[PDB]
Amino acid sequence: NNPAIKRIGNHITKSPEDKREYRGLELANGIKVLLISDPTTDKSSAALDVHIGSLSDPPNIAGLSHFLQHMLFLGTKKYPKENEYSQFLSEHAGSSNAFTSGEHTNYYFDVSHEHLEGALDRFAQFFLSPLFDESAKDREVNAVDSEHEKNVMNDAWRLFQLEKATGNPKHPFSKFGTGNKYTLETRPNQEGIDVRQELLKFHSAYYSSNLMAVVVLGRESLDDLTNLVVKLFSEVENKNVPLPEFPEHPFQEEHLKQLYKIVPIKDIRNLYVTFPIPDLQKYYKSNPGHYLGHLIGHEGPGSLLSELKSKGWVNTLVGGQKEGARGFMFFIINVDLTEEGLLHVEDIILHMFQYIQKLRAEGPQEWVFQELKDLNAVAFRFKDKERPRGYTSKIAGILHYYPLEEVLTAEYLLEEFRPDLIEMVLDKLRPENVRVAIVSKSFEGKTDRTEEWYGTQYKQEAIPDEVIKKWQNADLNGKFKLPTKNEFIPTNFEILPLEKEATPYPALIKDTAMSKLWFKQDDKFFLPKANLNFEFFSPFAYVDPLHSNMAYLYLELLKDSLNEYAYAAELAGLSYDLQNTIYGMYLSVKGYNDKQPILLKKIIEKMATFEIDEKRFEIIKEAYMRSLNNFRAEQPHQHAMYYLRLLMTEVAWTKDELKEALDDVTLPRLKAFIPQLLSRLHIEALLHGNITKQAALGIMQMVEDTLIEHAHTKPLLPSQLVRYREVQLPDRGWFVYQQRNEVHNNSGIEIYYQTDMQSTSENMFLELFAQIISEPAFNTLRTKEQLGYIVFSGPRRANGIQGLRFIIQSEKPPHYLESRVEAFLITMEKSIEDMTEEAFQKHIQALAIRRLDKPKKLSAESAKYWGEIISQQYNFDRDNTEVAYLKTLTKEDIIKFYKEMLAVDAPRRHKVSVHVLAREMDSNPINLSQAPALPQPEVIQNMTEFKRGLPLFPLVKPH
């Protein structure tokens, strides 16, 4: 009947717990479409995936596909305002982004459910009549260069592109993907190329409707959603572009039996073992790569990782199938290297082929496939409700790979047990096919090659045939047994009935000297899952740097101890998180509630009766030292945030302080630390999910009784439960802390306009002003001025205080960015006075929609509560309370707030700035808007003296 629709998909199989409505379509022009009707969703969303990516980049214009991705946002024929897309979304509680892989370009947005169409119309125009304005082209090319510049000093990106540089250079795999100013402007303007033509030429060539997939999720009916998609997208022209495919592998014979010695930027020691394999995508129901990844990557008793760990050679192992484009895949094994493991790489690789040989000797195991099949089956049935933005983006990508009806299940459910494919893949994992990469600072100065795009220092060697042969004659190693039946797989998925006295927010069901137990039985999601969060308080976890180091190492050793045992539970959807905090320890247990108390007890017993393996202690301590040192190579803007956190917190130990004190951490001193840490505690816990009140009370009591028994834990005094305060900046003051980043050749800056203690009033003044400036700050400071790829503004909340913050990472010096952001602030003062009275209320409803967005999954709701609890504020109805007040704010209230707190001449201005200089930046002192003249900043020369000379804020009264 309808001619714009080539077909409609029969029922789209979904989880029986998924209340959303689905319909599959293929438009006349060949666009595969999935429509999602959720009358609940507070935000609607849509996404489009083009099966074109970096691999289709022209050889002479590296990165064109990624650059074009940036350019669709900046103006259409029907919506030619450069930022009409960003502006429309920002004014309607929306967000958007996109990425570019080798074979895909993925665009997605979300917006208030009442404006899906308006957003979708502006969005669809991306693929119909993009302007590619010559002025915006010359500006946005800098954003791409900042993005690459960011990644140049990143160890992961360097390895990523080093592999591409290592294979067949004729293969598209070797293409530089990111793009930068050289390949997108300098070199083209050198070769006479009109880039706007090549952007138009490419878009018109590859952005065909036959290579497109669309997902739209909104409150609208499935029929209404069908009409909408047909209305806006059926006019995309079908150029019948043949889908690019790459049968020939990027690694041929001459690229096998090769070894690479690579110099990293951080101090890391890693070993990568890779095998070229055929594309396993088609076998999505047999899934042989996962079967082998599951066994080879296993961390339980009898596993490869175990023996490598026991011999002190490796600490972590990751294995499985790595994606390449259509027609070629990889199999990777990734181990980090201890100081010893670096010297026994030959043996480590041998041990790898010994385990692989075991897998060949045992043959395919149907029970293993059954276990994997059953776990995925459960996982899909009780899948968590996704956020609309990420859900449309992911579905939009896999519409290209599976039938309309299988699109939801294809990546989860298993069907065929294929022992032939298991042997077929397993046969490609052989020493003649292997490629070895070693990453260690120990190759410093010993490299004879340089990777052109990132500068990576490396040396290429052929693996001796004598060594290949050793690997081929791999005996069976009696230390490698297959795993056993996973006893942690859940069997009881019964949702307990909702108790009479249940509450909508967490109830304080225990307030003893040792425990403060917050509890809420789930009344929204009804999945067999629960979240168990515990905060352990001890003044001895952060009393001084030495004790912080031991707090860390204690838990790192403890987790190391349990890993073998706990790994099974993780595969079974029962995971735990355990880490030291500036107040003590944090333990969270999330997953299926069935086997949950068994794991929780094993943890607390291990905590209270922990016995340290000295060999593990020395190895973890060494990795910890490198972890600290390796912070010198982090992004400049993260340095900025790091420093400011040190500057404004009452107590805070710097990395250097920790690093210096780490040598004094002997095994004896650690053994003494642990029982002292556990001797006096206060536990504040949130138990939330599919559990009853007395199950929770029993959980909490069991945790206590275990500690009391084995660690003789007494309570802490209420006066010991002191939280840290934030430094109180003086009226009209401006302080500047300056540091250099010795690794990255960009600079970073954070600017913090401290306002006042958190309050229902002061909270919303800030949040509303931050909303009004959110999009403009990005549009002015990045899109126009192109200060850098990373440009962020928004609230900063810490220790009960708050304020406005800007974060920029740029090539320009920090003191320059200071003026440009200062200039931008005056731009807003006018922008508000001229801003219409409706546009003001527009921003209010936008914030309101965001603040009231209902959590979709249990974990997300638990986080809301857990924030209220660790912040000592316990404002569980905060969203209704604070949004209500927000709506009464007037355009005048915000101007008084700005003139009094934020303006350059504000009476109560509180400005502290962190300047992180680039690696080579000398020690620093048109059509643009006017920057105001700034006072002389007081330069923090010493952080300890800075805090001594300033007051400390109070702490927010709770409730």
Binding site: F99, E147, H294, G297, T316, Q321, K322
Partner: peptide, 12 residues
């Protein structure tokens, strides 16, 4: 740890 299967992003 089994890992199964970058991508260059538009925005910070």
């Amino acid at each position: 740890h089994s890992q199964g299967t970058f991508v260059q992003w538009l925005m910070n």
